[PDB]
């Protein structure tokens, strides 16, 4: 898989990762201060916190018809925002929740 | 600092960390397959991908004005977007690329 040129995209599938691995090793190395304040955005700090909250409320009941309704209305486009369910395993994602919950507290 | 409640937000921004925290240790345990669906998203996968080509092209010679004139004009948005230059150094960040690209090859 090497057709004499290399620095331009095969399937452009390989350069997601070579972001993730760059990621990855600058969330590792702390190295990515710099990459932290250009990648250091208010609507992504505020989606970020925001799922943290909105999976947090999940738990606690608040999945968003608490304060999400003058956002759309209440959930109409966030509580079935196009995303996948099994396709996912989202018992998977409330397994590493109830890692962090069942850890030993 | 305890005051008795600690599932809400003393300042808010500790729930910044709880999710570099997570992510970052779901980026290391490969556990994140779920919240990575979840965040698999179009536009990020497109804005991630196009990070790692504008920084590219940058020091190739195409910043922008090569293929960045109909999102805009000619990088008259992103060229200048709301960032930090010295306030986040970036000859920090084009030291990172400078490691991966002056690694040993």
Redesign the interface.
């Known amino acids: 898989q090497s057709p004499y040129s290399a620095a331009m995209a095969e399937q452009?599938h390989q350069?997601?990762l070579?972001?993730?691995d760059?990621?990855?090793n600058?969330?590792?190395n702390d190295?990515?201060?710099?990459?932290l304040?250009?990648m250091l955005t208010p609507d992504e700090?505020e989606a970020?916190?925001t799922?943290?909250?909105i999976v947090e409320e999940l738990l606690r009941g608040e999945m968003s018809q608490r304060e999400l309704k003058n956002e759309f209305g209440a959930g109409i486009a966030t509580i079935t925002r196009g995303?996948?369910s099994l396709?996912?395993?989202?018992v998977?994602?409330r397994?590493?929740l109830e890692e962090?919950l069942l850890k030993s507290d």
């Not at 190295?31 to 990459?35: A, C, D």
């Open positions: 452009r350069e997601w070579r972001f993730v760059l990621l990855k600058a969330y590792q190295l990515h201060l710099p990459l304040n250009l700090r970020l916190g799922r943290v909250r995303s996948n396709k996912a395993a989202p998977e994602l397994q590493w962090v």
